[PDB]
């Protein structure tokens, strides 16, 4: 039931929660360019 | 009203007497299984 | 916040606080529950000559919070205008518990030979002999002998 006030109102989808958890890390060369940085 | 409400509700509490009826069923089952 | 307006140490601003009480006490049921202590201050003060009304709103707020033996204490402390009421919630439930204490007290003192009792506090017996006359002069004496059951 919803007898309240509220009546007023996998391809990547599976990997999507991790994607937004991956949305803060080098999304996808500077990794590999760091090789020649030193 | 003034002093006439509580024992009516006490007889209502004979659902506990119905609990005794349930335990009576129980001990019936047990006594007769033991008879077996 | 209606009790901080009481630094005037006479009853003459306690009366304005009570004129606020009997106006909006049901809205301010949240407010008096902290003020239980100063209602005690009003009951303890014999110079506070409105201590009848102190015990009145004391039994009111304790009827709200669900205190019942202290509702009995300050129900006896409420005075002579206490029993006379004809209201259908407050006064009849608390005189129900009060004369329930009267009959269990008369049972315990009927279980207590020759005195050494708890004496009649000075605001019992009111609706005993006043609603008893309702039962008598309503010309059916079954309550009039039911009290004789209940007192032993």
């Amino acid at each position: 039931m919803s007898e309240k006030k509220q009546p007023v109102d996998e391809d990547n989808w599976d990997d999507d929660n991790v994607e937004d958890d991956f949305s803060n890390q080098l999304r996808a060369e500077k990794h590999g360019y760091k090789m020649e940085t030193s | 009203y003034l002093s006439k409400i509580e024992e009516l509700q006490l007889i209502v509490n004979d659902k506990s007497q119905n609990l005794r009826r349930l335990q009576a069923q129980r001990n019936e089952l047990n006594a007769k299984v033991r008879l077996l | 916040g209606i009790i901080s307006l009481l630094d005037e140490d006479e009853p003459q601003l306690k009366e304005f606080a009570l004129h606020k009480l009997n106006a909006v006490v049901n809205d301010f049921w949240a407010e008096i529950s902290e003020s239980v202590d100063k209602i005690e201050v009003l009951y303890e003060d014999e110079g506070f000559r409105s201590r009848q009304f102190a015990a009145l709103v004391a039994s009111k707020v304790f009827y709200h919070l669900g205190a019942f033996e202290e509702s009995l204490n300050y129900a006896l402390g409420a005075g002579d205008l206490f029993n006379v009421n004809d209201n259908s919630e407050y006064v009849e439930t608390i005189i129900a518990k009060c004369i329930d204490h009267y009959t269990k007290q008369c049972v315990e003192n009927a279980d207590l030979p020759e005195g050494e009792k708890k004496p009649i506090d000075q605001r019992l017996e009111g609706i005993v002999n006043k609603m008893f006359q309702r039962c008598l002069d309503d010309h059916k004496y079954k309550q009039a002998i039911g009290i004789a059951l209940e007192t032993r």
Partner: protein
Amino acid sequence: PPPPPAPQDVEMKEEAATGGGSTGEADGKTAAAAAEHSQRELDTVTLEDIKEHVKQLEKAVSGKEPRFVLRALRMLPSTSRRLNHYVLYKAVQGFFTSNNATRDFLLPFLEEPMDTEADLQFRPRTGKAASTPLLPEVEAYLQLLVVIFMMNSKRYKEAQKISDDLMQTQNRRALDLVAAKCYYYHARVYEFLDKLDVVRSFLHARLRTATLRHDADGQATLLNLLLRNYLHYSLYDQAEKLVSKSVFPEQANNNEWARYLYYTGRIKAIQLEYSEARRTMTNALRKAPQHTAVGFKQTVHKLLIVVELLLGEIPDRLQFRQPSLKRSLMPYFLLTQAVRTGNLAKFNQVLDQFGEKFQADGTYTLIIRLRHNVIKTGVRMISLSYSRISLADIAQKLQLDSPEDAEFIVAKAIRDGVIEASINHEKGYVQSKEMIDIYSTREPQLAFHQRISFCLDIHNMSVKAMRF
């Protein structure tokens, strides 16, 4: 004229059960509650809330309410002939001409089952006669010639409060069960126009009268009314629950208690709480009854886990997301993304982008501590990460620019008690540690008392439920 036979059928199926059957279930019954037709009738009220009720349009106008409210009489055993009258009046809608006799002519129609005869003695038939006509009138609030009549119909329901209070007998386990619903609709129709003012004292004294003599499903439901009253308007009398916490019934309706704990979770959320508020939000969350009502958990869940957003330890919440809620959580998805991100310009640009939906929430408590939540997310992550970090590393990794406010951060984090981390006091430069080898053996078996004592509590509860 072929569809109105379906209200003709369900109407008689309702008041057959209600009138005759629950009157026979009121005569001598109700050992605890043998009025099973009361719960049957609340099921049919949910059925009239699924469907159109009886006569909102139904291809005609105003057929059943002038019809069936006559002639109940409760007499000599040929009152099934008055039921035969009720049944064989149904040639009027199919064959004859329908005429308008609702919402205007109802004012003597309600007085007809009293002015026929001394019908019967019990109030659930009176609550029937003022509820089962008038609840089919409330859900059409188009505010033109319909809402003043909801107003007067629930003034007759205030007369039903009067005839609930002075009716001669535990008929409150029918009338409070109907009155929960209809007093919610009271609050609805009263607050479709303005805030309700003396209806507050109506509700107060109505809570008072249901105190001990009949304390069955009235106190908790009227307290939901009072709670949502104090919720929709200014917030002064939550100290009333802090001083008069009498909120514990049998928790009967099994969803009333759930949403009750939800509403008081919003209360403790807006008073101040993380822990107790999030655990009663969690208990109401897992005490969601079903999903048989479309998308009604969803907006209320958006406002439910605001405190879990305020924890900072929340991931994206997407498992709840109705796709019809997506176009409304276009702010809220990026808001929990702003919880996962530590950006400051995005922390205020989500606000600068969605302040109107944040006002639709209307909770400033989230943004008054959500920056502090961002810095506590930072301190939880990095203080769980490294043993002896420096305050400069985390500080100028999160743009603090000075040692002394990083000192105040670490100091108020010790004051908030997450990690041991102290300062190698010369100019800052934290000397600290993590905490493994804290304890692992006698400390579980401290909590295992609560584990298995909770288990044996539920054992005895299943015993007292096996009793039924």
